[PDB]
């Protein structure tokens, strides 16, 4: 693409999105300032809405009153231009914050993936003759959830998994062997880096780049 | 069998006949070694230099022929290679013994 | 003509032109062109001695036409065999032989290189080649004539003549431009511009003659003529293609192995039997009426048309038995003599070929005879000619059911004639050691047999230039410069669109004898420079060592303040003459001056040191003026003049 | 050779020869000319899959001629170029009307064709490193 | 038709290329504007270092343009040509404000306005309005009003490329004129003498320091990453 | 064979067929000099094989053939979908007809 | 009918105005866009004969089927012989012919459905051949169908 | 079919309905049954004719009884040359200026002679200059090298 | 949301799902939806459905 | 490069504002005012040729 | 050909304005640089061979 610009298919004149809570649209009444999604290798991914409420001259928050915002239901989020939305975020609401100031009153609504599971208890262990990867698949598993993983050659005769999570224990076996964890959308992918694949797109700094960092050491 | 995009180079640096700058710095250094008592302004509204910059020019010039293929180089005006080599009908096949 | 409302899209247009504006760069081109007609879609000539106004190349193409197809251009191929391998050489020389009708190619370079609205005078329209070898030539009177009918128009500012160095010498070339410059000096408002007759040495049949120092004898006029014109040199080459017309073009053939032979006789081996020919002649020797009689009419139409096709086929390949049977022209008598009397069923002689038209134009008519009567289809046959067509196929065959008393018959004398071609070509075969397959051919034919060739061909054929006399470029400049700066600015120091390079290279020990001479016969130089191409080098008249008439601008300026004043004057012609009215002349005359003076054109700190304006009685005026009927005004004008060298010094002192 | 980048491709008004089994094809200014007459000649909504090509010109017949029409036939000419023909640049636009009674009026249309190769030319043997897919 | 006075009108549009009409979406004024008001920003980017007496310029952006211009509403009955309303100009701003300024449910937007009057052609959005209320009949009917107006201006991405025509990243011909030399063209189009020896392999060319003045070439782009 | 062709110096007049447009993928024209009139394919099949063969990826077929061969090529895809219907016919009747 | 009015070759022709030339060449694309639409033709007629190539009643004598195309404005000038226009059954014996090998592909759909029962008409091949000589082939192919 | 409802020998046009891509059914046309004709050819002339002549007769109803002289001649003239000037205004007229588009005459000698005062009669000439539609469109197209 | 129109004659599929959604791939899914197999020429009294477009 | 008289300026344009006065009747503009800014522009090894910068 | 018009020693040759020794100077330089061509044309030559 030599273009000079960022292919989308539509216009970029009017921004939409959707938040769906258990399978349908919260109602139209509130507003949403702000969202933020974040994903990274080898953690786990979060999202964040900032949404208008709280009235003094009631003594009271409406959407916290609400069912919508409870930890532990479903959420995702889809976003597009002029209604051409897509999906980014899948997850589980985990925690509900307010915020009051002289002249401003928030809630603030945090979600992460169900990668979550893995990281809330420590665990004692024996494996018997598996490689790194049928282990890698058993702590997955266990959670239920999705998996995706690079076989490797060598086979273990006993290795021991001692008073850690399993996230933790995942990330210590899987640096060893110079793999990367991937977590997307309720799936654990695990992979060696691919530096062969055609590029996505073309950014250049005299047409598209908005702001730009780097170093060499 | 297909056309391909036509691109040029963009590392113009190769440090021998072909690399005008090269020969052109080589140039000063030896007349800094044999001459320098004598001729020491080397600014570029100088006829000495103007001659040197001229020569290192031409030098390009030959080393690019120097380098053409040899199927153009020893071509005849009418195509073929009747007095340059013998050919595999020509030279490879053996009587029969 | 439309009929239906929409958007349509045109080739071809006429557009409306309708405002005149004064200008002085108004060029008159006298010349030679394809048609001259008033009317686009008329057959007669009428605009021929009527001079015209043209604002671009889409007016006139619409009312003179193009260019000359070039009869000149000559291909020529060979065959030969590289360690078995055929390699074919494509040779496309320059044309020797040209036509000597410029003024299209001569617009072109006027308009490309910015020149606005001008005259167009015919002499006459273009005539034929007598040979490949022999242009037509042009007839000095002719151009005599146009140079008297310009002199009757008031617009006109330059004199140009776009063929005036193909005239067959060069006493008439000089004798047309002294004439130019006597009209010049007689209207007092235009100027010349001159073109050499030759850039190359050239012969008059008794000496060697040098261009330069050939015009500076050539024009023997005073001072008084001189300062009306001006000279440059030498000729420009452009990027302009010669127009010609691919079928008019023969190709040469040679080869290592001669086929040309062998593919003719065997056409016509095929030519001579029962597929091409026998099958043909065999078959061809009130309103229902009418339908069945034209459906009858019409299947011998067709029979007879296609025994014409056979004809054709068969002089495209003799003849190229005959261009290849170079030795032995006892043969090539033998083969042309058979291909003549074969012709002779089908041409005037014996027209086989008119039958067939007539009896289309018949046809036509007896189906739309049925619009109105009865009468027309009985006409159509016995006043008018069906019966008296057929009986030109067969004299009465209506005789007998079977066609008898064929008294006469155009039919099937051609099964002996074709015998007689094909036993002549025969003749060729062990006679014919050099020509290939296409030898004696027409371009456009082989583009079907062959197009690798085809396509190399018409490439090297557009690889040759057209090269012009650099007057028309020169006018081009005139109007931008009086458009950018004014009158008052000299023409050089301009460069020149589509100009490749000059024809020759003059150097600087030449130059100097174009600028200054003895006889003040200055010739202003075209010349390249590094990085920007080819400029006008020089701005003087052919009185050049005069010290008030040296520079084309100065000259110009004058011609155009002196008509601006006297057309403001004609308001008091039949005015009394007396102090109120002298008064009123002189308010108006130093109210133009002023203007210019603003303008730039003239010299002088305050008004009073660049012109002055003198009437009255004891001081332009006597007494008996004022009894004649007499007024005089006397004006001075100081003027600018350019600046052509520049002196540099340097000095120093110590810090 | 050096003016390959216009390309080369079929006639419009495309016509099949019998003297050799081949159709008429056009190339460099040749093909550009026909170009634009194709262009000028379909509606907006004609093509199937390419439902925004060609002009609304169509929309000031029967209609006054006067400066607001004029500004708006100019405007409707350049954003069509702009869009669909990558080879050209328009140098001038005189819009005239030629008849006091018939219902004509007059376009002329002069351009200046590129000597540098577009990001928006699909031609072969260089889009695929110098414009867009 | 030259003897008429044209009014200036706005249309409102669905689409960011102008091609489909809102439906009942145009609005003709009945007094024109006395003028009208353009405005145009060009930004550089503007540092140097401490010790020098000038700074090194370098070119950033083009900002957006701007048109204001005002209106008179009034329904007295002095203006010839018009007559007066029964409801004076009540109908004439709510037909005005439908246009330039209310959100479409279709689009979820305000309207894409066209401004057309004589030569004037200009695309964008609404920024700014006030409309003040001056006369009224004793029921309290308006019958004269006055509205000042700003607009900014819309250009869609696809057609920004297409106008800043950007072009060492495409190829190029030229035709070999009397006096050039292989060097100086080099250094004309590439920014640097230094390429000749590339530009004359990609040609054929062996004598290279003569050039033949009908000679057509190609210059080809400079390799990426 | 069967179309008439016609030229475009005549009004709508018919002269001859389409015959010379498929000439050149025969490279013995022994084998069509009566094809309308054939029952025996095999050495006319053999024949077009070769050539299809020969232009395969050449670049350098006449472009009234290159769209013909291009779109026979783009049906082998319909030729896939539409030979599977035997089976959906057989499965349709044992399971939805017998309830098997 | 998906290409522009420009092109000529849709149902409300092309202005007068633009000349005979331009008339002709229409008609020259025509003629060339038919070698397409004959073939598609083909496919879509093929699906309507799906019942009869599988029937269990009496299946069809060819295996393969074509079309007239009458939707276009001046096929009774294209075609040499506008009587095949009429009649599909005579259009396929002309255009595709001998191509459709009937013996052999008649044989394999029978033998398709004889196997769905679990039963095997194989000894027909050489039995029938004691009986009769080269009509065994017509023989055997009704036989099949009366089986079933 | 078309292009014979447009032109046609005997001048009686006539208009099309017709479909188009997009945008459905348009009247194609606006010619009167005098189509060949140079004055009224077009229907929109003609209903422009009738509105303002109408317009005008009504006008001066208001001095059918007053005395026939220069002091009432004047007064007609003022009268109708006020309702064209606002038609011209409006872009019903052709002309840059007043002089082009129109023109009024009434007066002895001009339009009426002593016999016309004798019998009571007045006469009034009028001019009018009206702006036609365009039908057709032609493109040009023409080109430079760089 | 859903959506209904009348065809009027001059209408085509692609261009009717173009101006509906933004996009003129969905022509196959319209279709289907309202049974038609010869969606290339539509008859002029048809009344069609548009679905909205699923979300998640 | 700006040049009248004595003056010699070169640069860049930054501001500018066009105010348009009268028109014809069909709405041709016939008088216009423009305001304008203009910035300086040094090449950097002009500079250095310009603060001839001589202990060194 | 490589060097400038001021030096003199092109086709088009120095200005008569310029003076004799001036002239003789040019001379005097296309002999000294004819050292440096003929050894660079034996170069070309051998290719040849």
Excluded at chain 1, 125 to 142: A, G, P, Q
Excluded at chain 4, 26 to 45: A, M, N, P, W
């Amino acid at each position: 693409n030599n273009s000079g610009t960022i292919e989308t298919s539509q216009s970029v004149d009017r921004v939409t999105h959707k938040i769906l809570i258990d399978g349908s649209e919260i109602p139209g009444t509130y507003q949403v300032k702000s969202i933020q999604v974040t994903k990274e290798v080898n953690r786990i991914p979060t999202a964040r809405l900032v949404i208008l409420d709280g009235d003094a001259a009631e003594r009271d928050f409406k959407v916290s009153n609400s069912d919508h915002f409870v930890p532990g239901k479903e959420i995702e989020i889809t976003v597009g231009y002029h209604s051409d939305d897509e999906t980014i975020f899948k997850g589980v609401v985990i925690r509900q914050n307010l915020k009051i100031r002289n002249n401003q009153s928030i809630l603030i609504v945090e979600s992460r993936d169900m990668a979550v599971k893995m990281t809330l208890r420590r665990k004692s262990k024996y494996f018997y003759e598996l490689s790194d990867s049928d282990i890698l698949e058993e702590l997955i598993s266990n959670h239920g959830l999705e998996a995706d993983v690079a076989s490797t050659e060598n086979q273990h005769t006993e290795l021991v998994q001692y008073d850690v999570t399993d996230w933790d224990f995942m990330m210590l076996r899987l640096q060893a062997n110079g793999l990367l964890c991937l977590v997307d959308d309720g799936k654990v992918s695990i992979q060696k880096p691919d530096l062969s694949s055609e590029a996505l797109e073309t950014v250049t700094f005299g047409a598209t780049i908005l702001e730009f960092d780097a170093e060499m050491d | 069998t297909l056309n391909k995009h036509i691109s040029i180079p963009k590392d113009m640096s190769s440090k021998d006949d072909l690399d005008f700058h090269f020969l052109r710095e080589e140039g000063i250094r030896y007349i800094k070694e044999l001459g320098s008592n004598f001729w020491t302004d080397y600014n570029t509204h100088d006829p000495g230099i103007t001659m040197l910059e001229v020569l290192c020019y031409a030098i390009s010039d030959l080393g690019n022929r120097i380098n053409i293929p040899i199927e153009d180089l020893i071509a005849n005006e009418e195509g073929g290679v009747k007095g340059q080599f013998y050919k595999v009908q020509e030279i490879l096949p053996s009587a029969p013994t | 003509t439309y009929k239906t409302p929409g958007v349509y899209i045109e080739e071809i247009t006429k557009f409306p032109p309708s405002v005149a504006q004064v200008e002085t760069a108004i060029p008159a081109f006298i010349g030679y062109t394809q048609f001259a007609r008033t009317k686009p879609s008329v057959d007669s000539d009428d605009l021929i001695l009527k001079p015209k106004r043209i604002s671009s190349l889409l007016d006139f193409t619409t009312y003179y036409g193009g260019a000359q197809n070039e009869q000149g251009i000559t291909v020529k191929l060979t065959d030969t065999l590289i360690e078995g391998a055929e390699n074919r050489t494509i040779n496309v020389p320059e044309p020797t032989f040209k036509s000597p009708y410029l003024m299209f190619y001569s617009l072109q370079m006027y308009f490309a290189n910015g020149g606005g609205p001008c005259y167009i005078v015919s002499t006459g329209v273009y005539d034929d080649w007598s040979d490949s070898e022999t242009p037509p030539t042009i007839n000095f009177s002719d151009l005599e004539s146009g140079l008297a009918v310009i002199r009757k128009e008031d617009e006109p500012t330059l004199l140009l003549f776009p063929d005036a160095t193909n005239l067959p010498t060069d006493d008439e070339f000089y004798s047309l431009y002294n004439s130019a410059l006597m009209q010049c000096n007689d209207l007092q408002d235009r100027f010349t511009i001159l073109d050499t007759y030759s850039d190359q040495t050239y012969n008059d049949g008794v000496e060697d003659l040098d261009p330069i120092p050939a015009l500076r004898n050539g024009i023997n006029l005073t001072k008084d003529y001189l300062k009306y014109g001006a000279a440059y040199y030498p000729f420009v080459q452009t990027i302009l293609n010669y127009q010609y017309s691919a079928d008019e073009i023969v190709i040469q053939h040679l080869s290592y192995n001669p086929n040309a032979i062998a593919t003719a006789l065997d056409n016509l081996n095929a030519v001579n039997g029962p597929t091409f020919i026998d099958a043909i002649l065999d078959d061809l020797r009130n309103s229902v009426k009418v339908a069945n009689f034209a459906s009858l009419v019409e299947s011998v139409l067709s029979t007879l048309n296609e025994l014409i096709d056979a004809k054709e086929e068969i002089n495209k390949d003799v003849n190229s038995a005959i261009a290849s049977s170079e030795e032995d022209n006892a043969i090539k008598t033998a083969i042309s003599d058979a291909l003549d009397v074969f012709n002779e069923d089908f041409e005037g002689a014996d027209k086989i070929e008119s039958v067939a038209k007539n009896l289309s134009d018949l046809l036509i008519k007896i189906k739309q005879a049925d619009t109105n009567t009865k009468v027309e289809n009985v006409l159509s046959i016995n006043a008018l000619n069906f019966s008296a067509e057929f009986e030109k196929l067969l004299t009465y065959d209506v005789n007998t059911g079977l066609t008898a008393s064929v008294t006469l018959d155009l039919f099937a004398n051609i099964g002996t004639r074709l015998d007689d071609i094909i036993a002549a070509v025969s003749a060729a075969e062990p006679i014919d050691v050099n020509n290939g397959k296409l030898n004696g051919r027409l371009l456009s034919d082989i583009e079907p047999l062959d197009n690798a060739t085809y396509n190399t061909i018409l490439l090297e054929i557009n690889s040759h230039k057209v090269t012009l006399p650099p007057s028309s470029s020169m006018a081009g400049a005139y109007a931008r410069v009086d458009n950018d700066r004014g009158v008052w600015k000299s023409p050089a120091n301009i460069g020149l669109n589509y100009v490749s390079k000059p024809s020759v290279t003059v150097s600087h020990e030449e130059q100097e004898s174009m600028n200054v001479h003895g006889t003040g016969k200055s010739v202003n130089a075209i010349r390249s420079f590094v990085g920007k191409g080819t400029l006008v080098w020089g701005a003087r008249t052919l009185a050049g060592n005069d010290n008030e008439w040296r520079y084309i601008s100065v000259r110009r300026f004058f011609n155009m303040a002196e008509e601006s004043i006297k057309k403001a004057t004609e308001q008091f012609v039949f005015e009394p003459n007396d102090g109120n009215t002298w008064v009123r002349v002189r308010a108006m005359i130093e109210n133009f001056l002023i203007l210019q003076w603003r303008a730039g054109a003239l010299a002088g700190a305050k008004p009073e040191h660049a012109f002055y304006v003198k009437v009255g009685l004891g001081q332009t005026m006597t007494a008996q003026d004022i009894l004649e009927g007499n007024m005089n005004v006397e004006i001075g004008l100081a003027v600018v003049r350019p600046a052509e060298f520049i002196i540099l010094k340097f000095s120093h002192k110590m810090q | 050779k050096s003016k390959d980048f216009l390309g080369t491709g079929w006639g419009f008004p495309p016509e099949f020869e019998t003297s050799i089994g081949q159709v008429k094809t056009t190339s460099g200014v040749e093909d550009i000319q026909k170009s634009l007459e194709i262009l000028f000649s379909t509606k907006i909504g004609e093509r199937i899959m390419q439902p925004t090509y060609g002009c609304n010109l169509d929309e000031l017949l029967f209609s006054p001629i006067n400066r607001t029409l004029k500004t708006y036939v100019i405007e409707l000419i350049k954003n069509a170029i702009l869009y669909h023909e990558p080879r050209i640049d328009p140098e001038k636009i005189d819009i005239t009307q030629g008849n006091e009674i018939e219902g004509e009026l007059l376009i002329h249309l002069q351009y200046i064709v590129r000597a540098t190769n577009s990001r928006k030319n699909m031609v072969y043997p260089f889009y695929l490193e110098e414009g867009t897919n | 038709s030259e003897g008429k006075l044209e009014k200036l009108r706005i249309v409102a549009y669905k689409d960011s290329k102008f091609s489909d009409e809102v439906e009942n979406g145009e609005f003709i004024t009945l007094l024109n504007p006395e003028k009208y008001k353009f405005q145009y920003r060009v930004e550089q980017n503007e540092d140097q270092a401490s010790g020098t007496s000038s700074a090194p310029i370098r070119f950033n952006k083009i900002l957006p343009q701007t048109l204001e211009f005002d209106f008179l509403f009034d329904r007295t009955g002095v203006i010839a040509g018009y007559e007066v309303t029964e409801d004076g100009i009540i109908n004439d701003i709510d037909h005005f404000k439908k246009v330039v300024y209310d959100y479409n449910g279709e689009k979820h937007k305000p309207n894409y306005l066209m401004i057309t009057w004589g030569s004037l052609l200009f695309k964008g959005y609404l920024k700014e309005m006030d409309i003040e209320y001056k006369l009224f009949r004793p029921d309290g009917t308006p019958i004269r009003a006055m509205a000042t107006t700003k607009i900014g201006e819309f250009v869609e991405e696809e057609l920004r490329t297409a106008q800043e025509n950007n072009q060492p990243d495409m190829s190029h011909y030229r035709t070999v004129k009397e006096g050039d030399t292989l060097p100086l063209m080099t250094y004309r189009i590439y920014g640097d003498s230094k390429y000749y020896l590339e530009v004359a392999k990609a040609n054929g060319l062996t004598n290279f320091r003569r050039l033949k003045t009908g000679t057509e070439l190609i210059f080809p782009p400079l390799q990426k990453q | 064979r069967k179309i008439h062709f016609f030229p475009s110096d005549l009004a709508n007049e018919p002269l001859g067929d389409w015959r010379n447009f498929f000439s050149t993928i025969v490279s013995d024209k022994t084998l069509i000099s009566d094809i309308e009139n054939l029952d025996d394919f095999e050495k006319l099949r053999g024949n077009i094989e070769e050539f299809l063969a020969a232009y395969d990826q050449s670049g350098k077929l006449t472009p009234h053939l290159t769209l013909f061969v291009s779109f026979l090529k783009l049906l082998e895809t319909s030729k896939k979908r539409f030979n599977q219907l035997t089976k959906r016919h057989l499965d349709f009747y044992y399971q939805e007809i017998l309830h098997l | 009918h998906e290409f522009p009015e420009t092109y000529g070759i849709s149902d409300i022709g092309l202005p007068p105005k633009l000349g005979v030339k331009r008339a002709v060449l229409a008609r020259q694309l025509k003629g060339y866009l038919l070698f397409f639409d004959q073939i598609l033709a083909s496919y879509f007629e093929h699906l309507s004969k799906i019942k009869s190539l599988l029937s269990l009643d009496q299946g069809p004598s060819f295996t393969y089927f074509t079309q007239a195309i009458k939707d276009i404005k001046d096929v009774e000038e294209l075609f040499k012989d506008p009587t095949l226009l009429e009649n599909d059954e005579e259009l396929t014996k002309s255009l595709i012919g001998k191509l459709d090998d009937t013996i052999e592909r008649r044989n394999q759909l029978m033998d398709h459905l004889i196997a769905r029962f679990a039963e095997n008409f194989s000894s027909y091949a050489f039995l029938m051949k004691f009986l009769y000589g080269e009509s065994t082939d017509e023989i055997v192919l009704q036989d099949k169908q009366s089986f079933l």
